[PDB]
């Protein structure tokens, strides 16, 4: 099957150039039975097709009128990729950008999509998060359920990903949408409910990844000062 893997920075300063790449597996960028597209999504643009590239014994491009003066979509036949370049960005360009394949020219819909790349247009610097445990009270576990979590605070830009036990724990996980604080930095929490009986047989670790700052933090979340390496009191 065909897969599209996106890459490129998710933070662009106003007036500068957005640059993204879409790497194809299982098909050729020069296929004469496909067209390669970029489509963005945001509250201001809704889902908006931006343009396409396709090869028919010659390279062809088509660009949406909204972005025609600022956009370039180029193929790379050595790496089997296609790029998106959008010059002179403004805050109206903040969106999730997707690459997508259209069978033929796109006259049967877009069946294959990349994972999307959130691009934030901002002058603010990247900042990795601080990660704090959300440890429940011993009393709150008496009902058979223990809620545990991680607070992922003061990062920029979005997004952050949170897994539990390196992806082994998915049931009962809730990772909340981030909120933008008055400081202009984001914060979110990720929680999981588990059986209280598991608190002394199972270890719970949240794995936080903030790709813009290359920050990876793995925080163990348990409820006993006795066994601490660093002693207080």
């Amino acid at each position: 099957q065909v897969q599209l893997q996106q890459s490129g920075p998710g933070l662009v300063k106003p007036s500068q150039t957005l640059s993204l790449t879409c790497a194809i597996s299982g098909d050729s960028v020069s296929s004469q039975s496909a067209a390669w597209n970029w489509i963005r999504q945001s509250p201001s643009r809704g889902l908006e097709w931006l343009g396409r590239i396709y090869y028919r014994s010659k390279w062809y491009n088509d660009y949406a009128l909204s972005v025609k003066s600022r956009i370039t979509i180029n193929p790379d036949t050595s790496k089997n990729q296609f790029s998106l370049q959008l010059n002179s960005v403004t805050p109206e360009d903040t969106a999730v950008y997707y690459c997508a394949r259209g069978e033929g020219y796109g006259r049967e819909g877009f069946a294959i999509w990349g994972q999307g790349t959130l691009v934030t247009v901002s002058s603010a610097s990247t900042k990795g998060p601080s990660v704090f445990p959300l440890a429940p009270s011993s009393k709150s576990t008496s009902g058979g359920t223990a809620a545990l979590g991680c607070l992922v605070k003061d990062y920029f830009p979005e997004p952050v990903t949170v897994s539990w036990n390196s992806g082994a724990l998915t049931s009962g996980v809730h990772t909340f949408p981030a909120v933008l604080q008055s400081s202009g930095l984001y914060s979110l929490s990720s929680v999981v409910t588990v059986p209280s009986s598991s608190l002394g047989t199972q270890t719970y670790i949240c794995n936080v990844n903030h790709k813009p700052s290359n920050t990876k933090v793995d925080k163990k979340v348990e409820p006993d000062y006795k066994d601490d390496d660093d002693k207080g009191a």
Partner: protein
């Protein structure tokens, strides 16, 4: 250019219900229509193309009908995993999309399970205290969370976040975070989260005493 308009903008339906959503093109497009399903944090997924052709790997409960200017997407028997925003798109011309219709699952009332988390000692070292209140797996979405510090109602120092509807049990979860300076935090003893929800006979309070 061609404008695509979906109706309704949102709907709530029970599991097993037949759901119909419409898409109107501003000019005739014959059969040049696709329908997509988009779940939170995921790319749109193609469901139907050529107005009525089911895409490979999509369940047969999804069907498309219509022609010309008026199109319909039908879900014959709504499943909890069908919570999503659905989009139509024309490809007679330059690939324009409808604005989407959000489909939510109507289910029985479920009270939240409430949990309160004090700030970590590590965060306190840094000069700030975040106190978190969690409302887990409730329905419907409407809920009131009030913070009390030494029995004084708080205002303007908390932020809420709500998850999208769960794909398995059709509930919501909510976080409320109260943010104070370390100095303000250490000036008080009792931190309480008071929750009001249709599933609770009276408001539920979860609290802790600092230290």
């Amino acid at each position: 250019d061609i404008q695509m308009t979906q109706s309704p903008s949102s709907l709530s339906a029970s599991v097993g219900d037949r759901v119909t959503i419409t898409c109107r093109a501003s000019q005739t497009i014959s059969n040049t229509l696709a329908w997509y399903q988009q779940k939170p944090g995921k790319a749109p997924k193609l469901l139907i193309y050529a107005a009525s052709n089911l895409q490979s790997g999509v369940p047969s409960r999804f069907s498309g009908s219509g022609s010309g200017t008026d199109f319909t997407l039908t879900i014959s028997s709504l499943q909890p995993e069908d919570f999503a925003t659905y989009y139509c798109q024309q490809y007679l011309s330059w690939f324009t999309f409808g604005q989407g219709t959000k489909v939510e699952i109507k289910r029985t009332v479920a009270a939240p399970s409430v949990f309160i988390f004090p700030p970590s000692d590590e965060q306190l070292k840094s000069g700030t205290a975040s106190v978190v209140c969690l409302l887990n797996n409730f329905y419907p979405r409407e809920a009131k969370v009030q913070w009390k510090v030494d029995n004084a109602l708080q205002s303007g120092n908390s932020q809420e976040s709500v998850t999208e509807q769960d794909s398995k049990d059709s509930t919501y979860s909510l976080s409320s975070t109260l943010t104070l300076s370390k100095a303000d935090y250490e000036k008080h003893k009792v931190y309480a989260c008071e929750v009001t929800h249709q599933g609770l006979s009276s408001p539920v309070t979860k609290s802790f005493n600092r230290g």
